[PDB]
Amino acid sequence: LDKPEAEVQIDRLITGRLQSLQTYVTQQLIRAAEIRASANLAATKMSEC
Amino acid sequence: YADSFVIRGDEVRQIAPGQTGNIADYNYKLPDDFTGCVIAWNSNKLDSK
C-alpha cells in the first residue's frame, strides 16, 4: 500500500493491539485484588490458628 | 517555496506524496509528509513545437 493508505490499515492494528494490552492489564489488576485479599486471610490464620 | 518545472500530462500524477515513477524517483521527489499545494496547467500552446 501507498503511505496514506497504509497508515489507515496500520492505525487500526495499533489501536486494536494497544486496546488488547489495556484489557489485559485491567483484568490483572482486578485479579490481583482478589489474590491480595486471600493472602491477607492466610496471614491472619497463620497468626490466629 | 515555489518549485517550477515542465513534464508530460501523464506524469502529472507523479507530483504527489507517496507516489513513484521515473519523475517521482529520478527527477523530483516529494516527502510523504509534504505540506503544500500542487498547481499545473496545459502549456501545449506555448511549449510545443
Side-chain angles (χ1 to χ4, degrees), chain A residues 3-4 6 8-49, chain B residues 2 9 16-18 21 24 31 36-37 40:
Chain A
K3 167 185 176 178
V8 173
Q9 306 305 311
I10 299 293
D11 180 61
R12 289 180 182 279
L13 291 172
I14 291 169
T15 298
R17 289 177 174 180
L18 183 60
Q19 183 174 352
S20 293
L21 288 171
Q22 290 169 350
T23 298
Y24 173 80
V25 171
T26 299
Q27 294 300 128
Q28 291 294 305
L29 289 166
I30 293 167
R31 289 178 186 183
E34 183 176 1
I35 295 296
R36 185 178 62 250
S38 182
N40 286 341
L41 180 60
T44 299
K45 286 172 175 276
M46 191 69 78
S47 295
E48 295 183 29
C49 299
Chain B
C37 300

